[PDB]
Every structure is written in structure tokens, then in C-alpha cells.
Amino acid sequence: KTPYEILGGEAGALAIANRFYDIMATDEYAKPLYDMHPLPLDRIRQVFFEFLSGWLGGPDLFVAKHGHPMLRKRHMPFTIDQDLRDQWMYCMNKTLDLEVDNPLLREGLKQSFGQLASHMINQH
């Protein structure tokens, strides 16, 4: 069974994407990460969801509409240090605790996001 399947499919991917930004947008420690996002969040909420649907084994909605992830490259316009990586993970940890009831999948998702996040870092 895929992460997409275990999390309830579309509604599960949507809820993660939305909870992530919901928390990012109000939590103090992540203001800096939040401030890199020009408002409103409508499009990035939708795009991140599209990404999650395929990264979890549902429809590649991202690769259908925007092409391959190339996430490291796609983040190269921004300055991303350790500090911002940790802010991003802090938000996604909090999200996955609330959204993923399977504790194995949850720890699996945290580690795999944790790695992707570290991969984006481009300032040391």
C-alpha cells in the first residue's frame, strides 16, 4: 500500500499541504520562512498539493502540469540555510503528527522529508 493510499488519497494530500501552510503562516519560529512567500498562498497551497499527490504515489499532478520536480534546482532562486531548513521541518513535523495516524508511515515520512529539506540547503 502506498503512502497516498494509507493517508486516504487526495483528501489526505490536500489536508497535509493545507495544514503545513496553515501552521507556517502563524507560528512565530517560522515567520522567516513564511516571509519568503508572496501572498496570498492560494497557488502554492495548490502546487504543493499537486506535488504531494505524486510524491506519495497518487496521480503525478505536478509532473503532469509543471514537469519533473528537480526540487533542488527549483529552489535555487532562493537563499536557503540550515535555519530555514529547520523551520520547514518544524512545520512539516507538526503537520505529520496531526495528519498521519499510522506511526510507522509517520516516522517514514518525517525522515524522507527531512532528507529532501536538507538537499535544498544552498547556503552554508
Ligand code: HEM
Ligand atoms: C529549507 C527548505 C525549504 C524552503 C525554505 C522552501 C521554500 C520555498 C519557497 C519560498 C518556494 C516558492 C513558492 C512560492 O511562493 O510560489 C518554494 C516552492 C516549492 N517548494 Fe519549497 N522550500 C523548502 C523545501 C521544500 C521541500 C522539502 C519540498 C518538497 C518535499 C518543497 C517543495 C516545494 C514545491 C513543490 C514548490 C513549488 C515549486 C514550483 O512551483 O516550481 N520545498 N519552496
